[PDB]
Amino acid sequence: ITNFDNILFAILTVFQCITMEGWTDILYNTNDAAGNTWNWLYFIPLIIIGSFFMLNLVLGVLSGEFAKERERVENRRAFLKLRRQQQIERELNGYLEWIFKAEEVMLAEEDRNSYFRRKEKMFRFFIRRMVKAQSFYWVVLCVVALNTLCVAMVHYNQPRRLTTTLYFAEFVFLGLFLTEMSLKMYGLGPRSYFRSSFNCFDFGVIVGSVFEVVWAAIKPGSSFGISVLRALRLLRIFKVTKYWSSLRNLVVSLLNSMKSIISLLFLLFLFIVVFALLGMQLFGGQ
Amino acid sequence: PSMRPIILVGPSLKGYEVTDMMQKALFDFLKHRFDGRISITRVTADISLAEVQSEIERIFELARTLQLVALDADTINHPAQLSKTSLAPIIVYIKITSPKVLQRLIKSRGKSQSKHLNVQIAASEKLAQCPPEMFDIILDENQLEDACEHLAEYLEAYWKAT
Amino acid sequence: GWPMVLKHSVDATYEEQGPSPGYRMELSIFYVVYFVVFPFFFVNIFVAL
Amino acid sequence: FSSFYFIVLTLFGNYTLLNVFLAIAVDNLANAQELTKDEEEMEEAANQKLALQKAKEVAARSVWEQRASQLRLQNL
Amino acid sequence: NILDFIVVSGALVAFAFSGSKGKDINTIKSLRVLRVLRPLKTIKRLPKLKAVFDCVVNSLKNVLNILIVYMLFMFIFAVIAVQLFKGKFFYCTDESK
Amino acid sequence: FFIYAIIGMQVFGNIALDDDTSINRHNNFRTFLQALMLLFRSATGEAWHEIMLSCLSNQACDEQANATECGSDFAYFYFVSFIFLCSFLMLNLFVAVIMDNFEYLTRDSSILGPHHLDEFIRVWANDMFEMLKHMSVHFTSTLMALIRTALEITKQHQCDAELRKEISVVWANLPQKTLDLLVPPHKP
Amino acid sequence: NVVRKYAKRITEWPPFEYMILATIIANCIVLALEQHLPDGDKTPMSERLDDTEPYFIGIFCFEAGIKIIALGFVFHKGSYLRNGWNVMDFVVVLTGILATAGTDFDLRTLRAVRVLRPLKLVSGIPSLQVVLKSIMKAMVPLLQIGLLLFFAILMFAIIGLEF
Ligand SMILES: CC(C)CCC[C@@H](C)[C@H]1CC[C@H]2[C@@H]3CC=C4C[C@@H](OC(=O)CCC(=O)O)CC[C@]4(C)[C@H]3CC[C@]12C
Ligand SMILES: COc1ccccc1-n1nc(C2CC(C)(C)OC(C)(C)C2)cc1-c1ccc(Cl)cc1
Ligand SMILES: CCCCCCCCCCCCCCCC
Ligand SMILES: CCCCCCCCCCCCCCCC
Ligand SMILES: CCCCCCCCCCCCCCCC
Ligand SMILES: CCCCCCCCCCCCCCCC
Ligand SMILES: CCCCCCCCCCCCCCCC
Ligand SMILES: [Ca+2]
């Protein structure tokens, strides 16, 4: 099938070399049929002109089209609406912190003179001030980092003292993270706990980890590997770095256009399904 | 008076928990930052219509000691509402430049005033069309600390002036 | 050589056992998610950056 | 003549795939770049205006980004 | 200058260890391979080659933020894969055993 | 490519060729050209992991080479770093080429460019009216006038002043009066 | 005629559209449930999947009839066959009807068009239509790159013939 016995065979093998799939086997075949001195002048230029140069042109044309389309009227309108939303949310967060400090000083003043209501509310305010303090940030990152060390060292044929150690450390870490979620949710309040998408991620991950623990208790053999996703909370170290804004706004753009992404990964699915059914029609069972 | 007294106004109607709490937090900072240098009092008689006159002389004899005097008025929701009276405090403006954050904040601040949102936003806007020169100090910050240090720095400038 | 690794991954019975063709056939979703993330998403993320 | 299935599936599946995922990456990364840029520009603008008003009372770019500004002006 | 010094030092130590005794071949061959940085000298000499190198390093530093995320994500996938296929990639030459 | 070819030659150069492995008569390290062809093969992603696995430690060494054990576990770093570096450098080449052209790639048909200049050169062969219908002191003053009418910098005197400012800024290399002589023709 | 043309415009009430959607996903699952054996062998469940076809072709024909009687055909400059997506639905349903003609050469190539039925999901969800237009808008400039690639392939194929 890969020969130059005809114009159509030559076109097919040249096209196969263009895709850089099996282009050396075709070269190593012309190194046996003829000498190997002059064959590289046919294929290396072919690869450079068909796979490297053409990919360059495709990237250039696509990026130019993206730049042209991005600065239209409706796309610019949507981006400015997103920017306005971000600014409004930032200002609202600042004013909410203002009002929370007001609440704190007021409640302190009334307590300076229903009693269990005041007790529980000052306890809530103390927790909410604790879970935002910089030391809680560092202790939680230390726990998360010490968690990934316990999952990065699981290897084949590990000592049995290590297997039980990590088995119990998984329970210890699940308890610690459940405690952290409980304190954070009670302090900030559930309506505000889910205001940050990363807290939604943490809640979902610990729920999945509990589900995995239960499922392993039922059937020890399987392992869904959801307890590892707690390593993604190491990604907050960027908060104390001058690069928080870039990454945070990347995630903001992704979550904003998360509907135009799901309806892109779906059309790809539809085309893959169409080609699967076409391949089943043509080559099914043969 | 010997000194121009401090008056807070601008977010929304006084007596409502939003403006009351924002002004109370700023007021508490101003109190415990300048301990031994400012006087604290609560005023419930309408100066804008000047029992009514029983307290203005009280303001003087606090303002006559070359010390800052804080006016916790309960009826002032406008800088020009007092413009006719000779008391002449400094019209501190706790401004928030976008009504949408105001509305979402009223939603955020409990459940009671959610039905009082419309009139409070309307009066806040009414105060918003007022010209800036009517006010003494503008508080455009969103952070508590930045607005606090701005007001404190202007207060230091006034202190050094007199 | 990713199809070979996919074939080994699906055709894997248990720890310290030999293969069995067609076993654990639902472990292709580990290799469909991986291509969606690293070869498709992250590569183009670097190219765009 | 059954190789047209594979030629079409490897042409319209290695460039449509690239188109989709590169569009996602470019759009979202450009949005992030503009968001950080605009928030920083607004930050120093507000800081400068605040310094001016507070003292009054008491008394490069990438080729993509310059070309984006040019397209903005032209479409305006 | 550090690169130039290490190249020269490798050459001189390789010459010094030339005892023709066969005591150590791995070390002398490594000191030979260290010569390969020799053409890397012309990038400090040519200003335009150094400019291209600086542009490449600038692009690398531009994508350094997402490279950390990338290696963290691939570490997570590697750990998931280890939990899945650890110990299972064994086989016989005889398919029946 | 030079650095990596020389390292490959000097480290994996004496692996015994075996057509059942990935170091063959076709894909060896034994000469600069064969090593460079091997690296080009790996760059395009042709079973480069198979080459790595055939270049590892404890391989059969070539008969005419003195050493008995040949190949090394340096192959992991060698091949992985080559893939990373080659892909990154070729990406930078691609992006440099793309951004050297970005005004062409983002061109608009309504807005002018070198295309209008070349077409006006074609107009050389009155016809100016036909081209004004066909559009998006003999052939330089007209060029300046058309460029002025296309992109805008008494308003006519202001345009002349802007032209003079630009000409002063971009005075040509060792010209007596090249753009200055055009200014008398570009004024009206 | 025209007295009834007024009524089946009202028939497109959204549960009708979602029922057409439901039969599209049903047909997609039926297609994905098939298995193929080499030499004319067929599975015991493929017979049931083959019997379920007339319901699908009938529902598609009924939908086409509603869309053809409520709207025009080609005449009013806005009609069924003057919409790009409605032409694909017409091709699918008409070819499914024609596949029940009882001839020899039909089955091998007239059963194959049945794989375009998942695209009726795009034809029925306008958001997917606009997303598809967004995808395909950025691949018109790639036509010149396609011509260039074909020209390069021709030149290198001619050289390969020569040598
Ligand atoms: C601190 C946070 C960011 C976690 C990051 C951890 C990894 C960067 C490190 C720490 C634990 C290390 C692992 C600790 C133990 C092992 C097992 C070790 O296996 C053996 O001893 C080989 C088998 C044998 O000899 O029986 C191989 C290296 C490895 C995976 C190490 C590789 C490097 C790891 C994953
Ligand atoms: C995540 O990326 C990788 C990871 C591992 C191996 C290779 C890559 N990889 N593969 C490519 C390709 C191939 C060519 C032809 C050059 O074209 C494009 C599409 C542009 C890239 C580019 C990179 C790359 C990107 C950034 C960085 Cl720091 C390092 C490498
Ligand atoms: C005796 C000749 C044996 C085969 C030699 C093949 C060499 C092919 C000719 C060179 C092809 C150059 C491509 C054109 C673009 C650079
Ligand atoms: C955009 C990517 C979409 C691709 C999703 C499908 C790819 C292949 C998935 C294979 C699932 C097999 C399940 C096994 C059940 C027996
Ligand atoms: C049937 C049990 C195993 C299922 C096979 C896939 C398990 C892992 C799915 C993807 C987990 C990672 C998601 C990406 C987030 C980093
Ligand atoms: C026994 C049959 C011998 C002849 C078979 C020739 C191949 C059938 C035609 C395949 C064409 C595929 C078209 C795909 C278009 C997207
Ligand atoms: C005969 C060699 C056996 C293994 C010894 C080498 C182990 C791996 C060495 C990797 C060196 C990489 C860093 C050098 C260049 C930065
Ligand atoms: Ca390949």
Q: How many CB atoms lie within 10 A of CB F128?
A: 12
Contact of F70 with F45, CB cutoff 8 Å: no
Cα–Cα distance measured from residue D76 to residue A131, given in angstroms and rounded to the nearest whole number: 47
- Could you give the CA distance from residue A125 to residue A51 in angstroms, rounded to a whole number? 62
Here the contacts of A108-112 (C-beta below 8 Å, separation 24 or greater) are none
Question: Strands B68-71 and B6-9, how do they pair?
Answer: parallel
Instruction: Point out the residue among C1, C46, C47 whose CB comes nearest to the CB of F47.
Output: C1
Contact G57, G85 (CB under 8 A): no
Residue E87, C-beta contacts closer than 8 angstroms, at least 6 positions apart: A156, A157, C15, C16
Smallest Cα–Cα separation from A7: which of G155, G157, G163, G153?
Answer: G157
Q: F79, F52 in Cβ contact below 8 A?
A: yes
Token couple for A100:
């929370």
Q: Do D23 and G138 touch (CB under 8 A)?
A: yes
What's the rounded Cα separation, in Å, for the pair B123 and B140? 18
Alpha helices for chain E (secondary structure H): 2-16, 26-33, 42-45, 47-62, 64-85
Burial of A177 (0-12, 13-18, 19+ CB in 10 A): buried
Q: Closest by alpha carbon to G132, among A271, D28, A75?
A: A271
Contacts of F101 by beta carbon, 8 Å cutoff, 6+ apart: A60
Strand segments, DSSP code E, in chain G are: none
What does the alpha-carbon distance between residue B11 and residue B94 come to, in Å, rounded to a whole number? 6
Which residues in C lie closer than 8 A to residue F91 (C-beta atoms)? 46-47
Residue A171's SS3 state is helix
Q: Is some CB atom of chain F closer than 8 A to the CB atom of C1?
A: yes
Residue at D72: amino acid letter: R
DSSP H/E element including D75: helix D63-75
Our CA angle for A241, A247, A253, nearest 5°, is 155
Length of chain A, please?
A: 286
Residue G54 CA to its chain's centroid (Å) = 16
Report the DSSP beta bridge partners of residue B92. Answer: B8, B137
Specify the DSSP element, H or E, that contains F9.
helix F2-12
Q: For residues E62 and C49, is the Cβ–Cβ distance under 8 A? A: yes
The rounded distance, in Å, linking the Cα atoms of G155 and A137 is 63
Kindly state the greatest CA–CA separation across chain E: 65
- Check C16 against E87: CB less than 8 A apart: yes
Strand intervals (E) in chain F:
59-60, 69-70
CB neighbour list of residue B46: distance below 8 Å, 6 or more residues apart:
B52, B75
Distance from C-alpha of C24 to C-alpha of C12, rounded to nearest angstrom: 7
B93 φψ region: left (φ > 0), alpha (ψ -120 to 50), beta (else)? beta
Q: How do beta strands F59-60 and F69-70 pair? A: antiparallel
The DSSP output letter for B4 is: P
Contacting chains of D (3 CB pairs or more, <8 Å) are A, B, C, F, G
Tell me, what amino acid is at F128? M
Start-to-end CA span in chain B (Å): 13
Question: Tokens standing for A95?
Answer: 């004013």
Whose structure tokens read 């007790």?
Answer: A119
C-beta separation of F140 from F185 below 8 A: yes
Rounded to an integer, what distance in angstroms lies between the CA atom of residue B28 and that of residue G109? 84
Kindly report the protein residue whose alpha carbon is nearest to atom 5 of ligand 6.
D2
Give Cβ neighbours of residue B82 (< 8 Å, ≥ 6 apart).
B7, B47, B48, B76, B88, B89, B91
**Any long-range contacts for F116-125 (C-beta under 8 Å, 24+ apart)?**
F116/F146, F116/F150, F117/F143, F120/F146
Nearest-angstrom CA–CA distance, E4 and E40: 9
Phi-psi region at A285: left, alpha or beta (left = phi > 0; alpha = psi -120 to 50): left
- Best of D22, D26, D61, D67 to substitute, by most chain F Cβ atoms within 10 angstroms, is D67
G161 SS3 class: helix
> Quick check: A13 and A26 in contact, CB under 8 A?
yes
What does each C-alpha distance from E90 to C13, C15, E21, E87, G1 come to in angstroms?
10, 8, 44, 7, 73
Q: What Å resolution does this PDB entry report?
A: 3.3
Which phi and psi angles does E72 have, rounded to 5°? -65, -45
Nearest Cα residue in chain C from E61: C49
List own/partner pairs for G76-84 with CB under 8 A and 24 or more apart: none
Which pair of tokens denotes residue G59? 């529902």
CA dihedral A45, A47, A49, A53 (to 10 degrees): -140
* Gap between the Cα atoms of A49 and G152, Å rounded: 8
- C-alpha–C-alpha distance, residues A115 and A98, integer Å: 26
CA A69 to chain centre: 27
Residue type, E72: L
Angstrom distance (rounded) from CA G31 to CA G35: 9
DSSP state of B80: T
